Structure 1
Amino acid sequence: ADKELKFLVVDDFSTMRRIVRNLLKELGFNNVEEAEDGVDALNKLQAGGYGFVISDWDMPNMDGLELLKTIRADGAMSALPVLMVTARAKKENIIAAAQAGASGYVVKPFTAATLEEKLNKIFEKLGM
């Protein structure tokens, strides 16, 4: 049943969505959907059933910081985990995402090992 947790993987670079979804599959999570920007992601989220978001930052139409802030401000999903996975590596970028409620932060390019470590840190708090 834990492995039924529903992920939304958001990035305008489809190669990154593949990498993240495939790591999830190796960890036993197959209930995974994708979105290419924050608008498409928010539309999927508002439809219900999600339990974890993994999101890029720079994307057209709505970026990942805007998405994160929207999620955190929406009482229907305000505690949804949101893992930032972004090429933006400056301390001030990390601080901004953190202050906005990010559950974790991974810099691209990444190893699957790093990504797993960050996911586990959050799972640990989900009691998984």
Structure 2
Amino acid sequence: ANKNMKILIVDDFSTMRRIVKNLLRDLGFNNTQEADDGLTALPMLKKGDFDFVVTDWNMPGMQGIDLLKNIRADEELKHLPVLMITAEAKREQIIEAAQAGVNGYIVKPFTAATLKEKLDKIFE
């Protein structure tokens, strides 16, 4: 589990993107880039050669479940594991997201400890 998979962090909230960049940094992961909406993650995704996606749900460009679908449907990208960060903790929301192919889930707030527990287990 490389402290160096290249990770895309998607969220319409810059402070959120950076609270996340640092807990990842605390964890041994530095290689990170950001995107503020799914509409602007995909073309990053499409040729950036990433290894892992962490994305929010609530985004207005392209909501996060939609990005996940475009990923699952792009043949070059559907092998990517996606951790989803959540805003609104509902069992009807999670179901729909597992149904769309998400690898794991996490609920805000979260800590660098709930985070690794979530990591050790996607690559699972």
Q: Report the TM-score range of the alignment, normalised by the length of the smaller protein.
A: over 0.9
Tell me how far apart the structure 2 counterparts of residues 91 and 4 of structure 1 sit (CA, whole Å): 32
| Whole-angstrom CA distance in 2 between matches of 1:40 and 1:57 | 14
The residue aligned with 2:103 is: 103
Contact 2:23 2:111 in 1 (8 A): no
Alignment partners' CA distance in 2, 1:2 and 1:58: 29
> Structure 2 CA distance, aligned partners of 1:4 and 1:121?
17
Q: Deviations over 1:9-47 (max 9, x none)?
A: 000111111111111111211110000000111011011
Question: Deviations along 1:45-89, whole A, 9 cap, x unmatched?
Answer: 011310000000010110100000110111101010100001111
In the alignment, what sits opposite 1:118?
118
Counterparts of 1:46-61 in structure 2, within 5 Å, are: 46-61=46-61
Which TM-score applies when normalising by structure 2?
0.94
Q: How many residues align?
A: 124
Report the TM-score, using the length of structure 1 for normalisation.
0.91
Query: 2:34 is matched with which residue?
Result: 34
Match of 2:23 in 1: 23
Which residue pairs with 2:78 in the alignment?
78
Determine the C-alpha separation between the residues in 1 that align with 2:15 and 2:115.
15
Give the counterpart letter for 2:107 in structure 1: V
**Secondary structure at the residue paired with 1:33?**
strand
Offset, 1:102: 0.4
**Amino-acid identity (%):** 65
Unaligned 5+ segments in structure 2 are none
Q: CA RMSD in A?
A: 1.3
